[PDB]
Amino acid sequence: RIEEEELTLTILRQGGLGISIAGGKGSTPYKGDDEGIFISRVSEEGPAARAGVRVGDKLLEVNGVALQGAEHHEAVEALRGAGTAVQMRVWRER
Amino acid sequence: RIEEEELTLTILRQTGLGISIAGGKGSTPYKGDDEGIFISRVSEEGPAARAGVRVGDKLLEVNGVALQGAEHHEAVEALRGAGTAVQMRVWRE
Amino acid sequence: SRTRRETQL
Amino acid sequence: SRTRRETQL
Ligand SMILES: OC[C@H]1O[C@@H](O)[C@@H](O)[C@@H](O)[C@H]1O
Ligand SMILES: [N+]
Secondary structure, eight states: OOGGGOEEEEEEOOOOOOEEEEEOTTBOOSBTTBOSEEEEEEOTTSHHHHTTOOTTOEEEEETTEEOTTOOHHHHHHHHHTSOSEEEEEEEOOO | OOGGGOEEEEEEOOOOOOEEEEEOTTBOOSBTTBOSEEEEEEOTTSHHHHTTOOTTOEEEEETTEEOTTOOHHHHHHHHHTSOSEEEEEEEOO | OOBOOEEEO | OOBOOEEEO
């Protein structure tokens, strides 16, 4: 992890975040041996795209809920109950 | 981690190991955001090269010492005190 | 030999 | 902004 390089993006839900997530502890890794939660898809018309979310981003926190080393369902539950504003901490390569 | 995809290579220490490691928790990552212990160099004439070790391998255990989430010095101490036979399991591919 | 999981949100 | 560490063994 590189927490000093992480980004914070806020999705203003209008139901509907306009993303797909993949991965999780014990799941088939999204890339290499990384079992993290990744943004696998971003809808061009959804709020996540407008908030600056991109495919390939690694999801590390959602509204205070830490997702480092989390199982897939834990991220889903954190995102489904996040509320109108979904503050996500992500890491991307630059 | 993918334990089903890991390799186990046994290095016969020379009367060294012929490798360099880099990375570790809190250190500059060897690649991306991965703070794991990586093989950064492999001497072409050293025992690690002949034992099948390759640059880029992620080091996960050395003679029972688990290195997942370990600091750099923990890997060094585990490898330096491993003995004449250094059984390390790594992940590649 | 794992379960691939993907969820649209 | 971290310490890069490399050790020859
Ligand atoms: O492919 C695996 C590697 O991908 C890189 O992008 C790193 O972020 C990390 O995931 C590492 O294990
Ligand atoms: N799940």
